[PDB]
Structure 1
């Protein structure tokens, strides 16, 4: 989607403590949004373990079943490294895989 949070007011920069201001929220139709407003001095003390969208895609990429940036030793190695299985009626089929994780590089 595309959730954006911005100021509703266009003037009165640095408002007074306790002042009413308008929070403007643009986002996808039908979505439910959760909020929290934190002093930044908490984050100056401890900014670890903050969740973000980039870490979400990082967790998904760590859950990927493909292990190689393409190609392969043969047609079977192409599918097996990509994360696919193939089996034909003539007999040609992919290599057997019994491990969930990717093989580790020599490094």
Structure 2
């Protein structure tokens, strides 16, 4: 969907230690937003293990039931390499898959 968090103030200057500021949140409807403010000085000693949208899709992508970027050695191979099992009454069925993860 979408989620942006900008300043609610009319630009102006920089805030002062101990001042109120409007925090605008442009997110999706019916969505629960969890916040967390952290001093950048913390990322100076360690900036690893940071939750990023890039890492989220990274885990999802590295979990596809497919391995081959495309095509196979035969018709029954194209389906298995893509993530599908084609089986007809004529006798043409795809290869058996035992291992959860991809080969190699």
* TM-score category (smaller protein): over 0.9
Structure 1 gap ranges (5+): none
Q: Secondary structure at the match of 1:21?
A: strand
The whole-number CA distance in structure 2 between the counterparts of 1:12 and 1:87 is 67
- CA apart distance, 1:95: 0.5
Structure 2 gap ranges (5+): none
Q: Secondary structure at the match of 1:78?
A: helix
Q: Secondary structure at the match of 1:33?
A: strand
Dislocated runs of 4+, deviation >4 Å: none
The structure with the greater share of residues assigned to strand is 2
- The alignment's TM-score, normalised by the length of structure 2, stands at 0.96
The whole-number CA distance in structure 1 between the counterparts of 2:62 and 2:11 is 44
The whole-number CA distance in structure 2 between the counterparts of 1:65 and 1:10 is 49
The whole-number CA distance in structure 2 between the counterparts of 1:45 and 1:85 is 50
Count of residues in Structure 1 that have an aligned counterpart in Structure 2: 104
Deviations 1:12-60 (A, max 9, x none): 3211001100000001111000000000000111111011111000001
Q: Secondary structure at the match of 1:85?
A: coil
CA-atom RMSD, angstroms? Answer: 0.8
Indicate the residue corresponding to 1:97 in structure 2: 97
